């Protein structure tokens, strides 16, 4: 065996130039697609908020047109999915993990146009869903599409091009190349067996799509929080406790998303019309809340800098929290096309902040600033629910550029994954794939 090992070492890191070049082309396409998607969404939210001025007089007519618009967009989305590609429903990440396990097809000819225009409807309609799902899935399918277009053979090419397209998608959703690479090598990849995935190719693809992102989003940030304060050693324990809180809440939140997934399937029993209409109702409800109390709807990115700065009151924080737990559950569980990463970033921020506030009044001698707890908690829900701490920590880092909070962030995120395990719970994406795969049997 030692002779085989020696042979492999001596042959390590030699990826066929063709796969690398195709990873470059994939990265470029995924990046362009993610830019186009983001712009379309923004344009829709804009138009919608522009109609509210052409009808800004009759208040009831306002609360009416907000709802109608959002309903029509949500409905268009649910329709496009339920009618053409059922698989493009929800996050899309589980499905792609399945494809990495060769247990789920990659019908790109269907998913690409459906996930794109479908998500455009739901996101542009104001629903509490992120761009992460749609872009990562479109990424993967783009990778499959190029694989098929150049009829590339071998597991590696199939596995590599699929994984890079996914990573570049994540990169282009958050402008976070490192988070995009780490996500594949911590969550997406098969967790129980070896794989022929070329990291360097993933790298190339991510770089390419991130550059495509920069070509269209120069001089702006998704989340500008500025430079926060430092964290003394004697304050570290506070970040542990907060992790324990996320730890008890992580599993619970997972139970709810899955439960609500079932409970809502009952309401329409799988009927495409009761489905499309239920979605139209949730969507419209979001467009409605998107005016009355904006902090309860949308992606949540907007309310992050504010909450971190301490501009919200405790009561406002609790309100926003509960309302968002409800709208997030309602939107994701309903099978609507969208991600759950950002909503969880928002929730984590709010919870983290509230905790910081409490801490501040309880420990004046620590000279705390609630925002450090907001940043530490921002990725804590991704650590407790999806259970991919390293990717969350690096994503937050890449978005908030507050590396001096690195230790607290790791301490908080680790506490969450430690407490989430000893309270049971499962990696939400894994639980979902395990669910699709279980429902695929017992149905034979």
């Amino acid at each position: 065996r030692r002779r085989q090992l020696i042979r492999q070492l001596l042959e390590r890191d030699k990826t066929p130039l063709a796969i690398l070049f195709m990873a470059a082309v994939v990265g470029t396409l995924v990046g362009l697609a993610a830019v186009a998607f983001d712009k379309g969404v923004a344009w829709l939210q804009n138009q919608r908020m522009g109609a509210l001025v052409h009808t800004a007089d009759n208040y009831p007519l306002l609360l009416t047109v907000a709802f109608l618009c959002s309903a029509v967009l949500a409905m268009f989305g649910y329709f496009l999915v339920r009618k053409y590609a059922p698989e493009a429903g929800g996050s899309g990440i589980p499905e792609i993990e399945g494809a990495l396990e060769d247990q789920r097809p990659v019908r790109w000819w269907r998913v690409l146009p459906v996930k794109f225009f479908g998500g455009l409807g739901t996101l542009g309609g104001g629903m509490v869903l992120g761009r992460a799902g749609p872009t990562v899935q479109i990424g993967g399918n783009i990778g499959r599409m190029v694989l098929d277009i150049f009829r590339l053979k071998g597991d590696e090419a199939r596995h590599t091009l699929l994984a890079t397209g996914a990573a570049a998608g994540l990169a282009a959703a958050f402008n976070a190349p490192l988070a995009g690479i780490l996500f594949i090598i911590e969550e997406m990849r098969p967790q129980f067996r070896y794989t022929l995935i070329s990291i360097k190719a993933v790298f190339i693809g991510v770089i390419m799509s991130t550059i495509m992102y920069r070509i269209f989003n120069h001089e702006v940030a998704l989340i500008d929080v500025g430079k926060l304060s430092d964290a003394p050693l004697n304050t570290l324990w506070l970040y542990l406790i907060l992790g324990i809180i996320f730890g008890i809440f992580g599993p619970i939140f997972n139970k709810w998303v899955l439960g609500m997934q079932d409970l809502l399937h009952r309401v329409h029993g799988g009927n495409i019309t009761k489905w499309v209409l239920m979605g139209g109702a949730i969507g419209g409800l979001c467009g409605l809340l998107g005016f009355v109390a904006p902090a309860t709807s949308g992606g949540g990115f907007n309310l992050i800098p504010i909450a971190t700065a301490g501009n919200f009151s405790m009561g406002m924080l609790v309100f926003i929290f509960v309302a968002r737990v409800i709208t997030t559950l309602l939107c994701f569980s309903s099978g609507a096309p969208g991600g759950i990463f950002a909503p969880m970033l928002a929730l984590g921020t709010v919870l983290g902040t509230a905790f910081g506030m409490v801490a501040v009044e309880l420990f004046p001698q620590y000279h705390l600033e609630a925002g450090t707890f907001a940043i530490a908690g921002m990725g804590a829900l991704l650590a407790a629910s999806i259970r991919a701490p390293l990717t969350g920590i690096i994503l937050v880092l890449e978005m908030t550029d507050n590396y001096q909070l690195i230790l607290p962030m790791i301490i908080t995120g680790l506490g969450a994954t430690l407490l989430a395990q000893f309270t049971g719970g499962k990696p939400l994406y894994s639980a979902i794939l395990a669910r699709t795969l279980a429902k695929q049997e017992a149905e034979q």
Partner: antibody, heavy 120, light 107 residues
């Protein structure tokens, strides 16, 4: 690193005066500033502290607007307004930059201080 | 708020001698600090976190203690050690200071 506080002097009882503290030789912004005073022949006594963005300002257990601590990061200057001055307020006033080791904060660097005299 | 009482208000010691001053706390404290104040001049952070020396403080200077009793010590005292030493604790809010200890050069 220098802390030069001025404004002190003779003030009539019940009157009010504003002490200033000019900071130089370091980034004034990432630092918490604090005021402390020493009455003639007596011990030291903390007056209060103020964080970088002025979002937090704490005082000694002394009532209401008796003390108003402010700061101007644009001029790297710290301010302390005292009102209804009485004899107990006659003392040497020191501004101090705050910092910490393990986290149990200390008074990093002190200034030469300004003398305040309350008399008619 | 915590009351720090320094055991010796005034003490005299000839150069070259182990001098030790106490800082008792009314309650429990941790990682106390020490400041040196020479007549006519501003206080200088000398020892912090109970035993760490500030950059520039001679090795003859040491500090120790725990729970509710701390102490500053000077091994083979010099002539430039004469000053007033104040202990301070921010382990509890608001911070407080000791009554101070006056170190005079016996001769």
């Amino acid at each position: 690193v220098r802390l030069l506080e001025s404004g002190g002097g003779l003030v009539q009882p019940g009157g009010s005066l504003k002490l200033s503290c000019a900071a130089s030789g370091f980034d004034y912004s990432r630092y918490w500033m604090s005021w402390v005073r020493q009455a003639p022949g007596k011990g030291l006594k903390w007056i209060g502290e103020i964080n970088p963005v002025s979002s937090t300002i704490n005082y000694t257990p002394s009532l209401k607007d008796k003390f108003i601590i402010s700061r101007d990061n644009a001029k790297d200057t710290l301010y302390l307004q005292i009102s209804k001055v009485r004899s107990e307020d006659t003392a040497l006033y020191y501004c101090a930059r705050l910092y910490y080791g393990y986290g149990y904060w200390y008074f990093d660097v002190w200034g030469a201080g300004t003398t305040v005299t309350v008399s008619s | 708020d915590i009351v720090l009482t320094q055991s010796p208000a005034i003490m005299s010691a000839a150069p070259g001698d182990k001098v030790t001053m106490t800082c008792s706390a009314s309650s429990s404290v941790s990682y106390i600090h020490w400041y040196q104040q020479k007549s006519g001049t501003s206080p200088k952070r000398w020892i912090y976190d109970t035993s760490k020396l500030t950059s520039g403080v001679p090795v003859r200077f040491s500090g120790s203690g725990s729970g509710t009793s701390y102490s500053l010590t000077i091994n083979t005292m010099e002539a430039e050690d004469a000053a007033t030493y104040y202990c301070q604790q921010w382990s509890s809010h608001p911070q407080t200071f000791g009554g101070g200890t006056k170190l005079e050069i016996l001769r």
